[PDB]
Every structure is written in C-alpha cells, then in structure tokens.
Amino acid sequence: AIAPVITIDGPSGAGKGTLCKAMAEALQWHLLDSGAIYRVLALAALHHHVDVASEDALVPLASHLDVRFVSTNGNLEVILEGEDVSGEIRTQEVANAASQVAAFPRVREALLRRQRAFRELPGLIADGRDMGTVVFPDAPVKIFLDASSEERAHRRMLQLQEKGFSVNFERLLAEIKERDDRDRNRAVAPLVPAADALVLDSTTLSIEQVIEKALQYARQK
Ligand SMILES: Nc1ccn([C@@H]2O[C@H](COP(=O)(O)O)[C@@H](O)[C@@H]2O)c(=O)n1
C-alpha cells in the first residue's frame, strides 16, 4: 500500500513538535522530525571538521549521514552514528550551523532520499519547512502551522528559561526574524505553505486547541 502522509510545516516556535507527536501517538503512525536531521548534519559537520560553509563538502556528508531515530516509546532519541546527541543538537553552535547548511541546494537534495525513507505504513507524520512542498508534495494532508514572531520568540524565551539559561527577549526576537528570513527567502525549498495546505494559526490556540483542529482536519480525508 502507498503509505499515507500528513505534513506539518511552519516557522520555528509554532508547535510542530508537540503537535507532531500528539498526532503520531493517536493515529499510531511513524513520525519525522526532519528538523532534527539538518541539525545532526551540521553536528557531524563540526565533529568531522567539515567546513559547514562548503557546498561541495557538505554534500558528501549529507548523503552518507548516519542518523537514526528510535521507534521510541514515550520520548524521542536522536542518535548520530551510534550515540545519542539529543542534548547536543539543541545548543547554540548547532541550531546555528543547521540553517548554515539547509541553505545549500545540493545539500537539501543529498538529504532528500533519507527523509523520504521515513514513509512507511500505516503512514507518516512529517514535520519541517518544505515537507508538503518538497519532500512530500503528494501528501494527502498538508498543514502549515504558523504564528507571530514576537509570540514564537516569547515561547523560545520561556523554554530556554525552563532550564536555567540567560534569555533576553529583545534579542531572541531579532534572531527568530533572523532565522525566519533565511528560511522564507532562500533559493531552494523555502518556508512557504503548499497551495492545498491548511494555514493553521497557533498564536492564541492552546496546544489542545491545535491538535484538535488538525486531528479533525487530517481525519475526514
Ligand atoms: N524541513 C526543514 C526543517 C528544518 N530546516 C532547517 O533546519 C533548521 C533547524 O531545524 P529545526 O530547528 O526546526 O530542527 C532550520 O533553521 C531550517 O529551516 C529546513 O530547511 N527544512
């Protein structure tokens, strides 16, 4: 059977993570954090001294990238070539390099085959920026989760806050907008809602109010 897929795209800080796992737990499907794949790529590009600023060098690393994701059971596990990197892939040096890579056209293509392998029966819940417009433009369900930068920033400042880290708001906002821009305006697989994607807005919708509206969207079809 040709495995069904539901795509969740949108900016950083809209709630694609908790959505994505609330949907893969209730539907009983696999999940794809492809965002965790551009982050690991960069991490391998650091630990391997691979000039992250090199298209010709990033490409080999990307197409050979030895990443893995546990079928889990209650939490997620990001394992690079054999070891959990789940804490390391969320630091400053990485989330930077991550968008310092995704930007590479030839690198997005070298990463195209691994991601799509994430589609299997009973289905697949894909997360990212270009999932419903790139990797899975044939998706029978496409959701675009959006917000406001100010709000989505206000969310990163409390998350960074819930672990005891210095967070000034008036700086992170500009970074959000810093990150957003490069994503909404880069030459390949930019951040932009597929013509058939449901632009869902989570700026004032509770987590419950989001999974409920999306679960209801995927569900008729
Ligand atoms: N589908 C995706 C997911 C992430 N990315 C890229 O990877 C970076 C880190 O992803 P994330 O923080 O969402 O895990 C983003 O800055 C950038 O958009 C992408 O290009 N396409």
Q: What do you see in this structure?
A:
The chain is α/β, with parallel strands linked by helices and 221 residues long. It has a single domain (1-221), classed as Rossmann fold, CATH 3.40.50. The chain contains ten helices and eight strands. The chain has helices at 16-26, 35-47, 55-64, 92-99, 105-110, 112-116, 131-135, 149-159, 169-184, 207-220; strands at residues 5-9, 30-33, 67-69, 78-80, 83-84, 124-128, 141-146, 198-201. The strands form two sheets. A five-stranded parallel sheet has the order 2-6-1-7-8. It has a three-stranded antiparallel sheet with strand order 3-4-5, with helices on one face. It starts with a strand and ends with a helix. ATP, dATP, and GTP are equally effective as phosphate donors. CMP and dCMP are the best phosphate acceptors. Belongs to the cytidylate kinase family. Type 1 subfamily.
